[PDB]
Amino acid sequence: DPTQFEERHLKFLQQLGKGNFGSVEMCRYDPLQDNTGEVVAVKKLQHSTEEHLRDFEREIEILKSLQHDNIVKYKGVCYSAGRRNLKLIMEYLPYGSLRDYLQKHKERIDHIKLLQYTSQICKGMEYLGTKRYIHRDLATRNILVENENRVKIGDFGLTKVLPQDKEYYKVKEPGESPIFWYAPESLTESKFSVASDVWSFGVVLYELFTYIEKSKSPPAEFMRMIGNDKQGQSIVTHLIELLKNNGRLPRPDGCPDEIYMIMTECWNNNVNQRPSFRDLALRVDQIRDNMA
Numbered sequence: 001d002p003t004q005f006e007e008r009h010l011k012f013l014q015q016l017g018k019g020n021f022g023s024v025e026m027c028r029y030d031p032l033q034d035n036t037g038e039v040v041a042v043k044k045l046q047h048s049t050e051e052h053l054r055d056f057e058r059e060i061e062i063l064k065s066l067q068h069d070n071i072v073k074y075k076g077v078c079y080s081a082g083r084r085n086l087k088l089i090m091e092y093l094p095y096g097s098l099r100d101y102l103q104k105h106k107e108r109i110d111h112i113k114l115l116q117y118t119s120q121i122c123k124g125m126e127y128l129g130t131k132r133y134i135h136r137d138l139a140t141r142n143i144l145v146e147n148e149n150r151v152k153i154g155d156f157g158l159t160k161v162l163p164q165d166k167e168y169y170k171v172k173e174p175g176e177s178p179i180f181w182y183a184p185e186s187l188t189e190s191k192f193s194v195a196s197d198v199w200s201f202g203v204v205l206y207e208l209f210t211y212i213e214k215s216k217s218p219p220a221e222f223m224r225m226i227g228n229d230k231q232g233q234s235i236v237t238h239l240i241e242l243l244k245n246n247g248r249l250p251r252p253d254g255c256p257d258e259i260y261m262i263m264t265e266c267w268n269n270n271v272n273q274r275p276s277f278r279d280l281a282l283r284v285d286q287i288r289d290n291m292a
């Protein structure tokens with residue numbers, strides 16, 4: 001009943017943007033028409049194909065199954081438009097994406113604060129992994145800011161559930177892929193695992209310590225490394241060979257070496273040699289303790 005959202009009571013307020021296969025709007029759920037309703041984030045599919053509706057229902061099921069302080073809260077589903085025009089209702093996180101929050105404030109968010117966010121992302125990812133879910137899109141653009149003290153993992157649009165018998169999930173026909181955050185085995189074999197999210201987490205830590213400086217983003221740096229003359233599929237071929245030959249993102253300007261050590265550990269070509277999220281959360285917490 002309260003998790004039952006009727007479309008007629010959903011008042012559009014502003015467009016929030018684009019997700020992993022649809023659009024997000026800020027809506028006020030106002031069943032008393034007095035503008036006193038809760039402000040929510042609503043995902044609706046732009047192109048309701050059979051494969052896309054199926055993926056959206058899986059995302060909705062995945063989000064519903066997650067209860068953690070550092071995972072964006074699922075609120076409900078709005079069916080009023082029929083089962084072919086589903087709306088996902090999430091909590092509204094008013095500070096927006098960590099990418100945009102950090103780009104806005106830059107060095108005003110100190111290393112203590114960045115490691116508090118890093119710790120939270122680890123705890124979110126570790127809980128995610130207990131459920132055998134592979135996020136597949138860990139990036140500061142998909143991490144949301146609740147307040148200056150708490151971040152949460154968002155966009156579960158690419159999340160996969162591991163087979164019962166396997167420690168990886170093979171994507172047979174990939175869609176739009178954030179290749180600059182991808183592990184080598186994800187680029188070569190399209191294999192995703194907890195270990196490939198750890199690789200992506202190392203990229204997020206890189207992102208945090210660059211403070212989203214335009215020319216320092218992972219695509220900018222990797223493109224500079226493989227050559228800005230590389231286009232389309234060729235980018236993927238060269239990126240694979242670069243990673244195989246230990247080409248990596250640089251240490252961000254002013255990054256503590258302790259933190260860069262973690263990034264490079266996440267970026268290990270050997271899948272089995274990557275740290276766990278349990279151990280990353282313990283290590284980042286010990287770093288924060290040594291700083292306080």
Ligand SMILES: CCc1cc(O)c(F)cc1-c1cc(N[C@@H](C)CO)c2nc(NCCCCCN(C)C)ncc2c1
Pocket residue numbers: 016017018019024041042043059063072088090091092093094095096097141142143144153154155156157
């Ligand atoms: C419903 C889509 C969705 C699906 C998922 O599976 C999921 F895990 C999360 C979300 C989702 C997606 C959002 N934004 C996208 C576009 C960016 O990643 C959210 N945006 C906000 N607040 C944004 C405020 C920005 C403005 C701030 N200025 C005023 C400074 N709150 C909650 C959000 C929740």
